[PDB]
Amino acid sequence: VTDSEKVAEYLRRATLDLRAARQRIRELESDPIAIVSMACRLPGGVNTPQRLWELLREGGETLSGFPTDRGWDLARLHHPDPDNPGTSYVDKGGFLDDAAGFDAEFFGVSPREAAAMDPQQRLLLETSWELVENAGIDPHSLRGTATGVFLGVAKFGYGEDTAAAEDVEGYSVTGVAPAVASGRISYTMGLEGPSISVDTACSSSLVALHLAVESLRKGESSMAVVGGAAVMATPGVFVDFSRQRALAADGRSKAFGAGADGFGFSEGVTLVLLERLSEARRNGHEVLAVVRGSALNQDGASNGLSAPSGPAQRRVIRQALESCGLEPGDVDAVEAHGTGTALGDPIEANALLDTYGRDRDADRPLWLGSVKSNIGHTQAAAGVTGLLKVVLALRNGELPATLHVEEPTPHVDWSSGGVALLAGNQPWRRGERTRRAAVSAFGISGTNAHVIVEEAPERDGRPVPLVVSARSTAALRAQAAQIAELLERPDADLAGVGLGLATTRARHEHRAAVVASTREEAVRGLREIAAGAATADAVVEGVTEVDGRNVVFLFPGQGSQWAGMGAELLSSSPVFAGKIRACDESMAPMQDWKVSDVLRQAPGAPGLDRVDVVQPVLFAVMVSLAELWRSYGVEPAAVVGHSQGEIAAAHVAGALTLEDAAKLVVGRSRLMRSLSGEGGMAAVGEAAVRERLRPWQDVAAVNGPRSVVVSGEPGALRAFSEDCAAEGIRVRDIDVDYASHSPQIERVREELLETTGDIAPRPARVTFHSTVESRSMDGTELDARYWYRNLRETVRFADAVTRLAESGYDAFIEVSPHPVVVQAVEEAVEEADGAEDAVVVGSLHRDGGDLSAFLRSMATAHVSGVDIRWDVALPGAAPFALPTYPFQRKRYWLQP
Amino acid sequence: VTDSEKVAEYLRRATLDLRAARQRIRELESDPIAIVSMACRLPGGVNTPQRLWELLREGGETLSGFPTDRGWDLARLHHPDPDNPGTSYVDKGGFLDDAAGFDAEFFGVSPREAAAMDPQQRLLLETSWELVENAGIDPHSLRGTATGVFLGVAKFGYGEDTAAAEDVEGYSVTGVAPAVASGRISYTMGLEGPSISVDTACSSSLVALHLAVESLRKGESSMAVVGGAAVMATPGVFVDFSRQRALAADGRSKAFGAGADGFGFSEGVTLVLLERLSEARRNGHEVLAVVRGSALNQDGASNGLSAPSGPAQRRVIRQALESCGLEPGDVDAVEAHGTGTALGDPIEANALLDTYGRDRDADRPLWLGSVKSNIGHTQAAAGVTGLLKVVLALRNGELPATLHVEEPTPHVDWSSGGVALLAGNQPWRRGERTRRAAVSAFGISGTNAHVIVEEAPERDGRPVPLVVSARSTAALRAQAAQIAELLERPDADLAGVGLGLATTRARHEHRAAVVASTREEAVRGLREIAAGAATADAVVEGVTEVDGRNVVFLFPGQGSQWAGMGAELLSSSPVFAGKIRACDESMAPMQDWKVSDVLRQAPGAPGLDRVDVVQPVLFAVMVSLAELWRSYGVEPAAVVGHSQGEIAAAHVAGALTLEDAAKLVVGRSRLMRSLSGEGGMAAVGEAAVRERLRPWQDVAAVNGPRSVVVSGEPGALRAFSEDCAAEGIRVRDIDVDYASHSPQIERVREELLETTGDIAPRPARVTFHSTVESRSMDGTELDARYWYRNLRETVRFADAVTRLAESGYDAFIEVSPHPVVVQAVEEAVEEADGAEDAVVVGSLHRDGGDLSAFLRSMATAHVSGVDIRWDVALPGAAPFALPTYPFQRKRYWLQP
């Protein structure tokens, strides 16, 4: 190597490090911050951003009379004379419809604590839940994450007049402390990021935003919850501002109007969720808009404590613009404060003229509007409201008109032409030019805040399962009804709805599942759930306390087979079909026919009548069903088998390889077929059975305290059956052409060992509770002699299930094409002194051997706490927007 | 240039850019922050950090009973039964001594507003002023600066139990709003940095500190004010927590003690001043310690809302250590949040053992303590209080012992030995190993904060003026008493105290000044000021309203000469001697003597009798004094001269060069000598004298409405004197051998014009209000013809004085070795229509011409609003620490 190239490599490394350093500096200074969702409670029964957008664009108001359910004494409160004390001269204001409502149980709050709680905190809890739901995130997924909370909240004298009542738990404090406002959100959602509650007058919310941005840029918080709340429980503010004559007589905020005369106050709660743009892209979240820069400062020594200052506003605007490295011609509109104050509006307009309006393009003037003209003035939640207005304008591509600007104030020389007020709705559609806007807030204390916002960057008939959950039956019914209403539209994408329910919603104790192929059946089932009568077979429900289980796979013996089982699954399940094909190829150098042909009943294959064909086929089917179950996230904890089912279990446990299992099954099946028409079996008190059997010499298996199977020669079998039928319980016969688990087996031992003395077991990965020696077994112990013993000795199913049940296992999934052992398992569990909320489920049925039946089985399991990865059932689908949780509210108010 | 050299240049630029970028990254992330000043108000009459240190090191307690001056109904309040409602079973706690006191006038707030004010805000104002003064900074110097304010404060209920009245200004709302708590600090001090108030339970202060550090690093603020306040207006907290039995029976916080049983509450306010270390070093501030890193987080879904969580504490400790890049072995002591709670303390100790205690060196176990055990609980200001104690420990190099630790708690295991409690004071002298400590805060809301701290980096008999000022006479006397007591100490430094007063204190309305050379004269003068009798000589007082003045310079004519004038100045003033020496050099090729000889009265120098020597000496002295005035920052707005004085003025203004002025003055002096013993002058209504003069043929000047000057031949002079003597007012004579401003002069006209025709005047940088033509003149017009006319035509001194007076000028300075026109100027301004507070002052006196007299003259000027740059008088002196303002307090309290 020469000197020049050695210098060049150093230069290249230095340049790369320089680029990385510049990237880090940009990340720390002006990293773009995205917005993922938003939520709001606002006057006039407004609780969705869509409703607010409709109101704004239409151009309505929410002003109304005083509330009447808050214990206020309206009689003495009203008086015409402003000078009269303890009275106000206005009777119009914004208010919330149901501020007294709350659902204590959903948040695990006792009634007394709920009553002691400030309504603000309750509304923040509800709005935070709805916010996290809207973004498309499971609320439970945030437990244990660096998520911050930043709120602007202040006390409004709630419950002070309430006579001191006994309070052992100190509810009196935690219900009114502003810090607890965000502390309780963090506590309930389980967040670990910083929790802060600021109070800087009416600009609090934006202040809370600014801090949050820094936290997100310092890599200290992954997500931020930013917003404000204002719910006045007493009329004190009205009286105080009436003393100063700072209230509009009619109660309207006429921003920049000739008749501006004061404030129109209102309540409201608002929240937004913030994350880094790059992290939003990486996680796949959706983006509504982007934040670029912000600026804060103080008016300083102004003319009076509460008077505004123009120079401070100009300085903060310029700082905000320079921080993000933009120019004043880059902005298109401003959501100015505009509280309708007589003295303030001209100042703000002049500042805007001097900062943006100067040297403005003659054709592209700055559009100026105010949201306070419509919704009023919420103080603590004022700025975030303007931000939300800007976001809605961006999404809908339109600029709502601002009200009461028919006659602009003469004090601002609009002849300059740099700015213009939105007298009517203006299209703001996307195009080559970038869209940007600016939001402002000016606290009475003197702090000012200015923020810049920019547009976001440019961007079959198979079975469908649907899951729904809630914490109460009424809530579950309401949820089902809401989903039904949603699905009745022609636009709904059934797969999208299913995926959204499966992945973007939390799982509560009350659960209900519906598998459907068309929307009509789905809505029918949802109506059944809402009405409380789940008669249909496509609807299941349940209630559970634990989100997990200890799953066990049961592998039964004969009886489950039936012609055509698995035909549909072959075409519908690539995993199952692949397992069957693999088993076919593995079994290939032992025989001619293929299980794949047998299932389809193709031309030229044996039927399900000879042992040598049924046993391998059942083995293959059962293994494939086990693979399918595992595919959906259900990894077994232990495996149990019945007779040759043990083989399959061993293959599932990993102790054996597929080829060895095929050899074993083929061997045993052929050597058993060698005994065609030489023995029999029948079904049925173990001791009583043995005593009755003594007279002869011909016990096979034990399935419970009363279920018993007997085997042996035909003649003695008939003799015993005749006696038993003449004494009591029936003797049900079995379809088989031999006698198993009997001395008859002794003859064929040597050939079996000759054939199968070459298998090489392995260590196990899943507990293999053998039914032969009744204990956990090491994979090494399963040799040819073990399988001879398994074939020879008696079967102990009841004992195995009992040992498993009292060991802490509570879920039992029999892997078979038909339920034949569920009943015995249920009876044993009931007689067992183990977990009482056990769940037992089959896999398929004699009929309905299609994917839908398997999904119904999985839903029956899921509604009982077993985890399922429903997303697997919905390949290629995209999630869909859904409504929020239907809270069941009650009244909680502390009255004097 | 070879390829290698160019590649080397590219490489060098890349490397330097990379290094600068890494520096920028470090500045943004973990730039060290310095502490410059601190202030506190605490129980037991503790109002200074020094008192707190004394208390802690001695190991005292401030516990006391409930206040009796807040209106609380004590009889009903106290009761033993815990469950009896509306009563408290604890009767001891920490309280401030003068919560109700406040100085209203100083902060410019009316008594009614102050009464409506929350005491917290008042104490915040006082403590903020004291904090800014302690740093060694003029509070008025922060006006128009980007200084942020961050506080942790919450409401307690001042004013709810009173009746609403006429509040036209909104005092009821403004007084109690927490946002206004910081808004008022910003407003009164004229700061433009962000003002933010937070509430996060007991950890609010450290959260504010974290935010302030972030803001300082971002460059958003130049300096930050951080701290908290907690004043208990009503006994709600006590009764409330009594309902829960959460309070200690004795009210003593036995942190980490076997007897810990609950809380003990106290009131307190604390503040600290922060700025980047490099900025403090560059500006030259004092550094008390360095803050390195901090971390905030939340308990998350802990065991209950109010319960603590150890894992969160460990996480925040690790984040705090990692933020600045340190190791647990680098910390020598921690100040826990030990509140004396049985549950909490073991958890915190266990968390500490797992982070610093793990793998800890066996010869330096981490020292553990808690300040709360001494001053109880401070709630909102708790965190910052701990930070205080550490800093003091750093400054004094000692760790105070902790109280109530006679028997450590058994729940925690100290056998590990990684952590040890501070049973007794431990020497902590500065040495090779760096000293570091940590502070912790855990709020009930669930927010946990951790911070790290490090020690700061390593580092005649002339006259002296002492200045004092205040907004009230009583405050001024109190200040003077404080300064005298400071000087009475043996360690007191005179120059340091003088400079500290000059540069580190704001200048207020009422002012006083004492010039002294020894501490004895100083202390006596201060005592006389404190007595209210300014009878002494080296003491001046006054009251001024404006901080500036339109100053004017006055140059009198003959009369101010005397023997020995300027002897002390030649030695005690380099500027004066330099200017006079320059004049001598400029004067060399016209004469032989040096004016220095005449002033020193060196042998062989002409006496002050011959007119050919007197005038140039006055010229030189006047220009030298003008330069002396300039050097102290007293720049003249305009100049005015009497007779030859204009020449001097012309040099001060800049129209004439020193050499040219010497030429003109020497020529005039010689031509006047040429007419020795041929004329006379005498002093004296202009009309009354003009009507008298008609008979003869000889008027010289006009000094005022009655003061007039006459010149003429000896015979007519004596005749006029005889006539006026037998008619009334006297006629003073003048010592001179000629007649000036008369037809006599016309003889020597042409020779004067020829000799002095080489001058080349220039534009004048300062207004030159010529008295020859009664208006301002440009320099270029001042030719030899003009100067001949000056020597010839009458003077209009009074008219010039009046015109300058009514034109807005208010301060007149007579730059001369003796005042000869002070009375006339004072009268002239009296009958004018300008400012009524015009100040007039001389420069020296016949009796006394040393630097001290000139300083007294400048003090007489300064006490009337004229700015002076005193620090020039105190070169090299190191500033000295001084006490803060002596607030005069009155009771303001809203009673039920």
DSSP assignment of A587-643? HGGG-S--HHHHHHT-TT---TTSHHHHHHHHHHHHHHHHHHHHHTT---SEEEEST
Nearest-CB residue to B160 (from A146, A160, A445): A160
Angle at alpha carbon of residue B755, lines to B751 and B758, rounded to 5°: 140
Three-class secondary structure assignment of A535-573: CCCCEEEEECCCCCCCEEEEECCCCCCCCCCCHHHHHHC
- Reduce the DSSP state of residue B802 to 3 states and report it: helix
Last residue before each gap in chain A (C to N over 2.5 A): 459, 684, 698
| Structure tokens, B71 | 């209106």
| Structure tokens, B217 | 């690093």
DSSP B497-564: HHHHHHHSS---SEEEEEEESSHHHHHHHHHHHHHT---SSSEEEEE-S-S---EEEEE--SS---TT
Q: Among the residues of B93-231, which ranges form H helices?
A: 111-116, 119-134, 171-176, 178-189, 204-218
Q: Report whether A376 contacts A63 (CB < 8 A).
A: yes
Cα gap A395→B844, rounded to integer Å: 80
Give how far B169 is from chain A: nearest CA, Å: 6
CA dihedral sign of residues A786, A792, A798, A799: negative
Angle at alpha carbon of residue A886, lines to A880 and A888, rounded to 5°: 170
The CATH number of the structural domain formed by B680-736 is 3.30.70
| Structure tokens, B846 | 């016949």
Q: Report whether B619 contacts B656 (CB < 8 A).
A: no
Angle at alpha carbon of residue A777, lines to A771 and A779, rounded to 5°: 115
Give how far A81 is from chain B: nearest CA, Å: 14
- Reduce the DSSP state of residue A265 to 3 states and report it: strand
**Half-sphere CA count of B783, side-chain side, radius 13 A:** 6
For B136, phi then psi, to 5°, come to 85, 35
The CATH number of the structural domain formed by A31-70+87-455 is 3.40.47.10
Cα gap B504→B483, rounded to integer Å: 14
Tell me which of 1.10.10.10, 3.90.1150.10, 3.40.366.10, 3.40.50.300 is the CATH number of domain B552-678+757-866. 3.40.366.10
Give the Cβ contact number of residue A84 at 10 Å: 11
Q: Which segments of A299-390 are extended strands (E)? A: 333-335, 366-369
What does this entry list as its resolution, in Å? 3.7
Among the listed residues B581, B604, B593, B576, the one whose alpha carbon sits nearest the alpha carbon of residue B669: B593
| Structure tokens, A779 | 């994979």
Give how far B116 is from chain A: nearest CA, Å: 14
Q: Which residues contact A127 (CB under 8 A, 6 or more apart)?
A: A39, A40, A41, A227, A269, A270, A271
The conformation of residue A408, written as its DSSP 8-state character, comes to: B
Q: Report whether B830 contacts B856 (CB < 8 A).
A: no
Nearest 10 degrees: CA dihedral of B104, B106, B110, B112?
-10
Q: Report whether B210 contacts B293 (CB < 8 A).
A: no
Number of H helices, E strands in chain B: 30, 27
Number of residues in chain A: 896
CB contact under 8 A, A240 and B192: no
Cα gap B594→B602, rounded to integer Å: 10
Q: Which residues contact A214 (CB under 8 A, 6 or more apart)?
A: B214, B218
| Structure tokens, B235 | 């006994």
For B67, phi then psi, to 5°, come to -65, 150
Among the listed residues A200, A209, A372, the one whose alpha carbon sits nearest the alpha carbon of residue A298: A200
Q: Report whether A212 contacts A455 (CB < 8 A).
A: no
Nearest 10 degrees: CA dihedral of A764, A768, A771, A772?
20
DSSP B281-322: HHHT----EEEEEEEEEE--S-SSSS---HHHHHHHHHHHHH
CB contact under 8 A, B446 and A306: no
Cα gap B572→B583, rounded to integer Å: 18
Give how far A83 is from chain B: nearest CA, Å: 8
Tell me which of 3.40.50.300, 1.10.10.60, 3.40.366.10, 1.10.540.10 is the CATH number of domain A551-674+760-866. 3.40.366.10
- In chain B, residues with a C-beta closer than 8 Å to the C-beta of A187 are 299-302, 305, 446
CB contact under 8 A, B164 and A239: yes
Q: Report whether A286 contacts A300 (CB < 8 A).
A: no
Q: What is the largest CA-CA distance in chain B?
A: 120
Cα gap A883→A286, rounded to integer Å: 17
Cα gap B203→B676, rounded to integer Å: 91
Among the listed residues A119, A451, A93, A100, the one whose alpha carbon sits nearest the alpha carbon of residue A293: A451
Shared fold status for A461-547+869-896 and A551-674+760-866: no
Q: Where do the domains of chain B lie?
A: 27-70+85-455, 460-547+867-896, 552-678+757-866, 680-736
Nearest-CB residue to A197 (from B22, B199, B300): B199
| Closest residue in chain B to residue A214, using alpha carbons only | B214
A581-598 burial code (b ≥16 CB/10 A, e <16): eebbebbeeeeebbbbeb
| Structure tokens, A157 | 């004298």
Q: Which residues pair with B682 in a beta bridge?
A: B710, B733
**Half-sphere CA count of B7, side-chain side, radius 13 A:** 13
Residue A333, amino acid:
A
Q: Which residues contact B327 (CB under 8 A, 6 or more apart)?
A: B321
Tell me which of 3.30.479.30, 3.30.565.10, 3.90.420.10, 3.30.70.3290 is the CATH number of domain B460-547+867-896. 3.30.70.3290
| Closest residue in chain B to residue A241, using alpha carbons only | B170
- Reduce the DSSP state of residue B84 to 3 states and report it: coil
For B694, phi then psi, to 5°, come to -55, -45
For B774, phi then psi, to 5°, come to 60, 55
Residue B700, amino acid:
A
Q: Give one word for A677, left, alpha or beta, with left for phi > 0 and alpha for psi -120 to 50.
A: left
**Half-sphere CA count of B211, side-chain side, radius 13 A:** 34
DSSP B656-711: S-HHHHHHHHHHHHHHHHHTTTS-EEEE--HHHHHHHHSSS----EE-SSS-EEEE
The CATH number of the structural domain formed by A461-547+869-896 is 3.30.70.3290
Q: Which residues contact A141 (CB under 8 A, 6 or more apart)?
A: none
Q: Report whether B269 contacts B228 (CB < 8 A).
A: yes
| Structure tokens, A155 | 């006390």
Cα gap B706→A217, rounded to integer Å: 80
The conformation of residue B877, written as its DSSP 8-state character, comes to: P
Could you tell me the CA-to-CA distances from B15 to A2, A28, A408, B24 in Å, in that order? 22, 22, 59, 14
Q: Helix, strand, coil proportions of chain A in percent (round to 5)?
A: 40, 15, 45
CB contact under 8 A, B298 and A195: yes
Give how far B316 is from chain A: nearest CA, Å: 10
| Structure tokens, A70 | 């808050």
**Half-sphere CA count of A164, side-chain side, radius 13 A:** 13
Method: cryo-EM
Counting other chains too, the contacts that A782-790 makes at CB distance below 8 Å and 24 or more residues apart are A782/A650, A782/A655, A782/A656, A783/A759, A784/A752, A784/A753, A784/A756, A784/A757, A784/A759, A785/A753, A787/A647, A787/A664, A787/A668, A787/A752, A787/A756, A788/A749, A788/A752, A788/A753, A790/A643, A790/A646
Q: Report whether B501 contacts B882 (CB < 8 A).
A: yes
Q: Which residues contact A194 (CB under 8 A, 6 or more apart)?
A: A148, A149, A215, A220, A221, B207, B296, B297, B298, B447
Could you tell me the CA-to-CA distances from A242 to A84, A236, A261, B163 in Å, in that order? 10, 10, 12, 16
Q: What is the largest CA-CA distance in chain A?
A: 120
- In chain B, residues with a C-beta closer than 8 Å to the C-beta of A192 are 297-300, 312, 315
Could you tell me the CA-to-CA distances from A741 to A613, A681, A738, A748, B867 in Å, in that order? 20, 10, 10, 13, 119
Q: Which residues contact A503 (CB under 8 A, 6 or more apart)?
A: A138, A870, A871, A879
| Closest residue in chain B to residue A245, using alpha carbons only | B168
Q: Helix, strand, coil proportions of chain B in percent (round to 5)?
A: 40, 15, 45
**Half-sphere CA count of A519, side-chain side, radius 13 A:** 16
Cα A304 off chain centre by: 52
Cα gap A470→A154, rounded to integer Å: 33
- If residue A171 lies in a helix (H) or strand (E), which one and from where to where? helix A171-174
- In chain B, residues with a C-beta closer than 8 Å to the C-beta of A85 are 164-166
B239-264 burial code (b ≥16 CB/10 A, e <16): bbbbbeeebbeebbbbbbbeebbbbb
Could you tell me the CA-to-CA distances from B864 to B502, B547, B802, B811 in Å, in that order? 16, 9, 20, 9
For B792, phi then psi, to 5°, come to -100, -50
CA dihedral sign of residues B229, B235, B241, B246: positive
Q: Which residues pair with A442 in a beta bridge?
A: A448
Nearest-CB residue to A301 (from B4, B177, B190): B190
- If residue A120 lies in a helix (H) or strand (E), which one and from where to where? helix A119-134
Last residue before each gap in chain B (C to N over 2.5 A): 459, 684, 698
Q: Report whether B86 contacts B93 (CB < 8 A).
A: no
Could you tell me the CA-to-CA distances from A719 to A685, A690, A710 in Å, in that order? 19, 15, 13
| Closest residue in chain B to residue A299, using alpha carbons only | B192
Q: Which residues pair with A293 in a beta bridge?
A: A452
| Closest residue in chain B to residue A181, using alpha carbons only | B445
Cα A566 off chain centre by: 33
- Reduce the DSSP state of residue B27 to 3 states and report it: helix
CATH 3.40.47.10 fits B27-70+85-455, yes or no: yes
Q: Which residues contact B12 (CB under 8 A, 6 or more apart)?
A: none
For A540, phi then psi, to 5°, come to -135, 155
CB contact under 8 A, B240 and A172: yes
| Structure tokens, A705 | 């305290």
The conformation of residue A169, written as its DSSP 8-state character, comes to: T
| Structure tokens, A423 | 């007298």
CB contact under 8 A, B146 and A297: yes
Cα gap B178→B192, rounded to integer Å: 19
Strands A436-442 and A447-455, by their bridges, are antiparallel
DSSP B86-100: T-BS---B---S-TT
DSSP A484-550: HHHHTSTT--HHHHHHHHHHSS---SEEEEEEESSHHHHHHHHHHHHHT---STTEEEEE-S-S---
- If residue A465 lies in a helix (H) or strand (E), which one and from where to where? strand A464-470
Could you tell me the CA-to-CA distances from A334 to A331, A337, A364, A384 in Å, in that order? 8, 9, 14, 14
Q: Report whether B762 contacts B655 (CB < 8 A).
A: yes
| Structure tokens, A625 | 């069903």
Radius of gyration of chain B (CA): 37
**Which class for A473: exposed (0-12), middle (13-18), buried (19 or more C-beta within 10 A)?**
middle
| Structure tokens, B323 | 């933020």
Could you tell me the CA-to-CA distances from A272 to A133, A188, A391, B491 in Å, in that order? 12, 18, 11, 62
Cα gap B728→B464, rounded to integer Å: 49
- Reduce the DSSP state of residue B415 to 3 states and report it: coil
Give how far B372 is from chain A: nearest CA, Å: 22
Strands A638-641 and A767-770, by their bridges, are parallel
Q: Which segments of B744-820 are extended strands (E)? A: 767-770, 775-776, 811-814
Residue A405, amino acid:
V
Q: Which residues contact A607 (CB under 8 A, 6 or more apart)?
A: A563, A613
DSSP A11-63: HHHHHHHHHHHHHHHHHHHH--EEEEEEEEEBTTTB-SHHHHHHHHHHT----
Q: Give one word for B643, left, alpha or beta, with left for phi > 0 and alpha for psi -120 to 50.
A: left
Q: Report whether B28 contacts A24 (CB < 8 A).
A: no
| Structure tokens, A746 | 């002794």
Residue B778, amino acid:
D
Could you tell me the CA-to-CA distances from A717 to A260, A442, A714, A734 in Å, in that order? 105, 98, 5, 12
